[PDB]
UniProtKB/TrEMBL annotation:
<dbReference type="InterPro" id="IPR036513">
    <property type="entry name" value="STAS_dom_sf"/>
</dbReference>
<dbReference type="InterPro" id="IPR051932">
    <property type="entry name" value="Bact_StressResp_Reg"/>
</dbReference>
<protein>
    <submittedName>
        <fullName>Anti-sigma-factor antagonist (STAS) domain protein</fullName>
    </submittedName>
</protein>
<feature type="modified residue" description="Phosphoserine">
    <location>
        <position position="55"/>
    </location>
</feature>
<dbReference type="Pfam" id="PF01740">
    <property type="entry name" value="STAS"/>
</dbReference>
<feature type="domain" description="STAS">
    <location>
        <begin position="1"/>
        <end position="111"/>
    </location>
</feature>
<dbReference type="InterPro" id="IPR002645">
    <property type="entry name" value="STAS_dom"/>
</dbReference>
Amino acid sequence: SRVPILKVDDYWVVAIEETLDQSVIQFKEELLHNITGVAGKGLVIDISALEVVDEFVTRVLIEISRLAELLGLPFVLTGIKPAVAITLTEMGLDLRGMATALNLQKGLDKLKNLARM
């Protein structure tokens, strides 16, 4: 448990910070364990802390995204600067077709708005 996984109003909230690499595997595993245990209304993951995004991180984000979809868990990715949007898309993450938001607040609001409909 290095990367904290928070729960707010039944939404999972995670912010990924710079890591000095197997802890990303460790993080993905713990997150997946959590979101398949107690039900939650959705998942927000913020990556604003990452100066560059790795091929490794990208694959973790693709897997979390696919599983969230299979689980029926609304998912929003937040804090994505232009340069990182380019890299993620080039490495196979479909940014256009997924929910993204500017920050954690916007992320949380987006999920609640979609649901309240």
